[PDB]
């Protein structure tokens, strides 16, 4: 589109999505797409100048 | 099974279910199965050996 941005800061959990590669460890996150408790969410936001 | 283990250790909330009979004091806690808001969730897992 002629004015979007799409993006993610954070949702409920402190590690911020695209460093995960920044020299981060962890051990079986065992990320999932349909909603499980005990895990954090993701808020996607869409942009139309502002 | 021969190598199984089946327990739950604690969700979101403080109390540890199987001491609730120790000598421990609540009003209308009023579990229910079905997910409702403003209660504690508990985690379930199963052992092959860790």
Same mark, same amino acid.
């Given at each position: 589109?002629?004015?979007?941005? %799409? ?13 995960v ?5 962890? +051990? ?9 408790? +005990? +895990?954090? %969410? ?6 139309? %100048?502002?």
């Open positions: 589109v002629g004015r979007w941005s %799409a993006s993610i800061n954070t949702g409920n959990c402190p590690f911020s999505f695209g460093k590669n920044n020299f981060v460890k962890f +051990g079986s996150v065992c990320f999932s797409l349909k909603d499980i408790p +005990g +895990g954090c %969410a993701m808020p996607i936001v869409a942009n139309w %100048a502002y």
